Design a protein around this motif. Sequence first.
Motif, PDB file in Angstrom:
ATOM      1  N   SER A 194      53.842  -3.496  65.880  1.00 16.69           N
ATOM      2  CA  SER A 194      54.486  -2.239  66.216  1.00 16.69           C
ATOM      3  C   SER A 194      55.558  -1.838  65.196  1.00 16.69           C
ATOM      4  N   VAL A 195      56.448  -2.779  64.896  1.00  9.91           N
ATOM      5  CA  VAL A 195      57.552  -2.568  63.974  1.00  9.91           C
ATOM      6  C   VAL A 195      57.067  -2.294  62.552  1.00  9.91           C
ATOM      7  N   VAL A 196      56.065  -3.033  62.099  1.00  9.53           N
ATOM      8  CA  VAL A 196      55.519  -2.839  60.765  1.00  9.53           C
ATOM      9  C   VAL A 196      54.759  -1.503  60.673  1.00  9.53           C
ATOM     10  N   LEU A 197      54.026  -1.150  61.727  1.00  5.90           N
ATOM     11  CA  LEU A 197      53.294   0.113  61.748  1.00  5.90           C
ATOM     12  C   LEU A 197      54.303   1.243  61.548  1.00  5.90           C
ATOM     13  N   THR A 198      55.372   1.189  62.337  1.00  6.63           N
ATOM     14  CA  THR A 198      56.435   2.182  62.304  1.00  6.63           C
ATOM     15  C   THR A 198      57.147   2.250  60.957  1.00  6.63           C
ATOM     16  N   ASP A 199      57.492   1.092  60.406  1.00  2.00           N
ATOM     17  CA  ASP A 199      58.170   1.034  59.118  1.00  2.00           C
ATOM     18  C   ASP A 199      57.258   1.641  58.050  1.00  2.00           C
ATOM     19  N   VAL A 200      55.951   1.437  58.196  1.00  2.00           N
ATOM     20  CA  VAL A 200      54.977   1.975  57.257  1.00  2.00           C
ATOM     21  C   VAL A 200      54.850   3.499  57.367  1.00  2.00           C
ATOM     22  N   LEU A 201      54.696   3.997  58.590  1.00  2.00           N
ATOM     23  CA  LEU A 201      54.559   5.435  58.823  1.00  2.00           C
ATOM     24  C   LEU A 201      55.816   6.225  58.456  1.00  2.00           C
ATOM     25  N   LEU A 202      56.990   5.625  58.644  1.00  2.00           N
ATOM     26  CA  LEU A 202      58.229   6.301  58.296  1.00  2.00           C
ATOM     27  C   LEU A 202      58.355   6.365  56.787  1.00  2.00           C
ATOM     28  N   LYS A 203      57.774   5.373  56.123  1.00  2.00           N
ATOM     29  CA  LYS A 203      57.786   5.285  54.669  1.00  2.00           C
ATOM     30  C   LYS A 203      56.787   6.275  54.057  1.00  2.00           C
ATOM     31  N   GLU A 227      55.106  -6.315  50.885  1.00  2.00           N
ATOM     32  CA  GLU A 227      55.204  -4.904  51.230  1.00  2.00           C
ATOM     33  C   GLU A 227      54.064  -4.057  50.671  1.00  2.00           C
ATOM     34  N   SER A 228      53.899  -4.059  49.351  1.00  2.00           N
ATOM     35  CA  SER A 228      52.857  -3.255  48.725  1.00  2.00           C
ATOM     36  C   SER A 228      51.449  -3.682  49.094  1.00  2.00           C
ATOM     37  N   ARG A 229      51.293  -4.917  49.555  1.00  2.00           N
ATOM     38  CA  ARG A 229      49.975  -5.412  49.956  1.00  2.00           C
ATOM     39  C   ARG A 229      49.487  -4.628  51.185  1.00  2.00           C
ATOM     40  N   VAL A 230      50.401  -4.357  52.110  1.00  2.00           N
ATOM     41  CA  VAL A 230      50.078  -3.614  53.319  1.00  2.00           C
ATOM     42  C   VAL A 230      49.899  -2.135  52.987  1.00  2.00           C
ATOM     43  N   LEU A 250      46.692   0.304  60.482  1.00  2.00           N
ATOM     44  CA  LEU A 250      46.713  -1.105  60.068  1.00  2.00           C
ATOM     45  C   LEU A 250      45.337  -1.782  60.153  1.00  2.00           C
ATOM     46  N   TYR A 251      44.310  -0.985  60.423  1.00  2.00           N
ATOM     47  CA  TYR A 251      42.930  -1.460  60.552  1.00  2.00           C
ATOM     48  C   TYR A 251      42.483  -2.519  59.529  1.00  2.00           C
ATOM     49  N   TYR A 252      42.765  -2.298  58.250  1.00  3.13           N
ATOM     50  CA  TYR A 252      42.373  -3.239  57.193  1.00  3.13           C
ATOM     51  C   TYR A 252      43.294  -4.444  57.058  1.00  3.13           C
ATOM     52  N   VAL A 253      44.501  -4.333  57.598  1.00  5.05           N
ATOM     53  CA  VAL A 253      45.510  -5.378  57.475  1.00  5.05           C
ATOM     54  C   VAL A 253      45.347  -6.521  58.461  1.00  5.05           C
ATOM     55  N   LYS A 254      45.557  -7.745  57.997  1.00  2.00           N
ATOM     56  CA  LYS A 254      45.439  -8.879  58.894  1.00  2.00           C
ATOM     57  C   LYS A 254      46.797  -9.303  59.414  1.00  2.00           C
ATOM     58  N   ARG A 255      46.784  -9.938  60.581  1.00  3.67           N
ATOM     59  CA  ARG A 255      47.990 -10.381  61.257  1.00  3.67           C
ATOM     60  C   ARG A 255      49.003 -11.061  60.347  1.00  3.67           C
ATOM     61  N   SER A 256      48.555 -12.025  59.545  1.00  5.23           N
ATOM     62  CA  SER A 256      49.479 -12.742  58.663  1.00  5.23           C
ATOM     63  C   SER A 256      50.123 -11.869  57.586  1.00  5.23           C
ATOM     64  N   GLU A 257      49.418 -10.843  57.115  1.00  5.10           N
ATOM     65  CA  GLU A 257      49.993  -9.964  56.098  1.00  5.10           C
ATOM     66  C   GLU A 257      51.083  -9.126  56.756  1.00  5.10           C
ATOM     67  N   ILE A 258      50.872  -8.808  58.032  1.00 10.52           N
ATOM     68  CA  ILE A 258      51.827  -8.032  58.812  1.00 10.52           C
ATOM     69  C   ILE A 258      53.119  -8.837  58.998  1.00 10.52           C
ATOM     70  N   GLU A 278      54.158 -11.290  57.083  1.00 12.76           N
ATOM     71  CA  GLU A 278      54.782 -11.464  55.777  1.00 12.76           C
ATOM     72  C   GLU A 278      55.504 -10.191  55.340  1.00 12.76           C
ATOM     73  N   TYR A 279      54.992  -9.047  55.779  1.00  8.94           N
ATOM     74  CA  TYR A 279      55.604  -7.762  55.469  1.00  8.94           C
ATOM     75  C   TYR A 279      56.967  -7.699  56.168  1.00  8.94           C
ATOM     76  N   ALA A 280      56.990  -7.993  57.469  1.00  7.68           N
ATOM     77  CA  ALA A 280      58.228  -7.955  58.247  1.00  7.68           C
ATOM     78  C   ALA A 280      59.278  -8.946  57.745  1.00  7.68           C
ATOM     79  N   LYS A 281      58.866 -10.171  57.435  1.00 15.99           N
ATOM     80  CA  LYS A 281      59.819 -11.154  56.944  1.00 15.99           C
ATOM     81  C   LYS A 281      60.371 -10.695  55.595  1.00 15.99           C
TER      82      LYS A 281
END
Lengths: 311, 311
Positions: A37-46, A4-7, A169-177, A179-182
């Motif tokens: 999409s889901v991670v972007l949203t969870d991040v922006l709501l946070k 989570e905090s990595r993203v 999410l520009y700096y974030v890579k697919r796999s970190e995304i 791992e964030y969701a899981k």
Amino acid sequence: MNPESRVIRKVLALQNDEKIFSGERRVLIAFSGGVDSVVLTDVLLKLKNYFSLKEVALAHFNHMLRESAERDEEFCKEFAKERNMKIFVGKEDVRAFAKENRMSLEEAGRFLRYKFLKEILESEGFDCIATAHHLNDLLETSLLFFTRGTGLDGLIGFLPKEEVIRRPLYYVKRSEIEEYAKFKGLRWVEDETNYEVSIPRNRIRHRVIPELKRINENLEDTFLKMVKVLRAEREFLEEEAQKLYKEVKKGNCLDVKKLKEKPLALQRRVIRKFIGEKDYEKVELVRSLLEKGGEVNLGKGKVLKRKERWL
Amino acid sequence: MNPESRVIRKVLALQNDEKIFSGERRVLIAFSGGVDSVVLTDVLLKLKNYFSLKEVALAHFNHMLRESAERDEEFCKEFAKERNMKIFVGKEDVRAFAKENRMSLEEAGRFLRYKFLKEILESEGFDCIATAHHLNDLLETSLLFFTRGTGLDGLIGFLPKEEVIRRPLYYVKRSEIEEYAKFKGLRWVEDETNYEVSIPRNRIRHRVIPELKRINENLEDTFLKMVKVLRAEREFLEEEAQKLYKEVKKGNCLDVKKLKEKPLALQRRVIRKFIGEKDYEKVELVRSLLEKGGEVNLGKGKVLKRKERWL
């Protein structure tokens, strides 16, 4: 340092580096329903208060490509309700549009999806659009320009902020995304976007990149550094080309006896601007008139009138 | 335009432009015996006078890696004999040297080979060494840098003129080298040079490029235009950087108050040359000092003191 905090750290760092948000109050999310999409949203709501946003809404576009589309729409609606957000739904037959316009599914989908996103932005009063585009999308885009023909611009690929569009999410890579969701136990769907991907991008995504990563395990981290180096170098080239531009230009003409004495790189940049064209061919064809009189036609005329030049 | 003029025109374009040859009188060719070598030589014999060369000689290096080594060496001596050229031959047990120095057969081979070539250059009085490195070699190198991390200087790969070494076939494609050979009836033999190619380079040559060509079958032509563009932009950067360097570099420190205001792109170039070690993380670490900073360490140290240090 968990998933989570990595993203969040990369999103906050992007904000500090680019000022993604700086006055916008209403953000429309390009919500396809996939992990990104889901991670972007969870991040922006946070980080909604953090960014001083007053409204974060979802916009899902139904491409009518497959039955799962209806399943996708349903997931998006339930997701909006579980989050207590407003959601706007759109629909257009992408496959059909692609065929009557002799274009690929990727470009037809992109065209109709953003048309829809932009319509909701104006009729509903939103300040910008948040996209889930990330570092791996950038890497793929960069490699596609290297392959098809490009200069500094194509290699740097898309930017984090681009007239109305925001890519947190520009700096974030697919796999970190993923791992964030899981890690946070999020739920998502295999949105219709996966089925519009062009053949060239699939080759690069599932064949080329995997091979490159066998050479360098941290390709994405390495690539990002290149992008940052390239962007500073481009910025410099642009600032310098601009000084020379408003130094050699007078009216609608260019001082050939001044330009010709300048570095090749700036000669081309000044010319690219003066004629509004990036084509390697057109630029050089026009550049040659700096050493020998004549004319050039591209649909507009460039004449060499001793020391000066029009268009 | 036949296969011959297609290669000669590219070589002429390189000369009349960059002066690959400008005063050198005696050239030594790195002659492996494969198509690349054979075509390079034929091209230099045709353009020998045009380049104002007095003598073109060959240098063949036997790696002792395959039982065909002797046949290959013989072919090379007869190649020289037939055209009344001088040929220098070398021979080293590359396997033994590799085990002795704990290095791969690839780097052992390249090391001994160039040592051999340079030894002849000095003891026989040659001005420069001509290699058969071409456009496909550049493309390979470019992708390797993209993969392992780099910036502008690496995306280019190598230059046509690199101290003592000249690469007349810089802009020529492999396929053009082969068509030339066919068209002119040039015979060739096994190229031991291919035994100096590492795993990653083979992956890019035999797996990646072929895949990228299924996207752009004109990749090499496309990549050529990019090189010419980046090449010039780099020259301009290298130019402006060196310039700034002398202005800020004074003794063994850097005028921070001044460098601090220069464009980000130039700051990195100056630092690269100042701390000798040019690696994104090193440079960025040091560059942090310019703007209110303490001290940093690596292989040496540096302190910010209204000026700059280095102990």
